[PDB]
Amino acid sequence: EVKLVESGGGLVQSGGSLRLSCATSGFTFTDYYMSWVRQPPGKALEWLGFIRNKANGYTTEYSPSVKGRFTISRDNSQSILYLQMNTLRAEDSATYYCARDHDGYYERFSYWGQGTLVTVSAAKTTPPSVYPLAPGSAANSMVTLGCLVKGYFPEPVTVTWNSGSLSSGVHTFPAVLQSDLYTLSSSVTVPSSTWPSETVTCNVAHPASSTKVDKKIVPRDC
Amino acid sequence: DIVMSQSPSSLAVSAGEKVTMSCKSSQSLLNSRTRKNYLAWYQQKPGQSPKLLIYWASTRESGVPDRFTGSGSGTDFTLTITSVQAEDLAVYYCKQSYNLRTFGGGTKLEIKRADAAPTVSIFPPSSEQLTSGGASVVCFLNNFYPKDINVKWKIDGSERGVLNSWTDQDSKDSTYSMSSTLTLTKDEYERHNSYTCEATHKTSTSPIVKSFNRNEC
């Protein structure tokens, strides 16, 4: 089965450079063009460039928007695609995707990576504080618990519940920026017969600060 | 360049109804040599990568439900969704590959459903936060419809440092959720007793009130 996996995104200062990678598998790499596409938060997809297949001499083309400033390359011995970005500006903050492109016949982008988030900013990395949200000592079939993930930079953070075995009935709220730091929260709703009877834990990761946190939701009494 | 334009910017349709959306190119996308229109449609669900739906204007990718149909030629193209499902919530993008590649601006598709009252939960600050001098009080207002909602915080009966956040519509039940966080200093937190999240939503003329008292913690 086909895999495209981006890496290299994170925090970089204005004027800085960054290189992204896209590791692929499960198709004949050299037969395929490969594209990069980006998406600023809440905005449209923007095509950046491509590198052609072996039959077409692995030649490159770029959007007018980034020609001269971004460079695409590929390692055909390892099936990895690269994007070198130079003189970065706030406008370059975006999720960057690789996509399998043309094979000389089909006109389509068949497969896309999960995306890697690039933030261009002068702000320092700050790890989140992770706080449990347990019903108060006075707060019913269902019960709602949560984690508050407060005061971090840059995005993103990931939150799961019981290592991803609780995924139904989860709401993970989009982060909001407030004086230079993000905060987000996540709720999970479970049968009241199951908590505190059974354990409920939120697992939070902040890649930029390599933070890994498991926070058990403990009842007020008990 | 080739400029790609889509319409509408957004719409909402009830499950089971038909959706029609449009994509215009500044130049014909009809390749004279191959006699195909180099126009593709992509679906991007909330928090996911774009997924190929349709290419060459009308060819449905394998795995794609039969309810999705691409049509059109030259400069004007249409994506039609029959019998829309809750899971079809997404931004839809067309993309030309006639001269390099260019994306349109997307059409957001939302789902209309029956009005639904929020389920409201309030949470006191954790001892782990208070130890560091801060006090965040959180209210979740979950699985309601329509999206418009009003939340106020009351402290000892008086309306009052607030962070609000809404989720994208839910792919399964077509509802919305919101989180509201009120942040105080520990000292200010400890000066008052009653903390109330009040949600006013069209589903009741009675606001949903959730409260706790610091003394009962």
Ligand SMILES: C=CCO[C@]1(C(=O)O)C[C@@H](O[C@@]2(C(=O)O)O[C@H]([C@H](O)CO)[C@H](O)[C@H](O)[C@@H]2O)[C@@H](O)[C@@H]([C@H](O)CO)O1
């Ligand atoms: C080294 C390239 C060569 O040329 C082409 C040709 O027929 O001119 C085009 C190739 O596809 C591209 C491209 O420029 O790489 O251009 C077509 C366009 O329609 C011109 O035909 C599409 O835009 C396509 O997506 C690519 O962007 C390619 O189809 C190639 C073929 O592999 C022959 O070996 O021939």
Ligand SMILES: [Mg+2]
């Ligand atoms: Mg006061």
Ligand SMILES: [Zn+2]
């Ligand atoms: Zn060229």
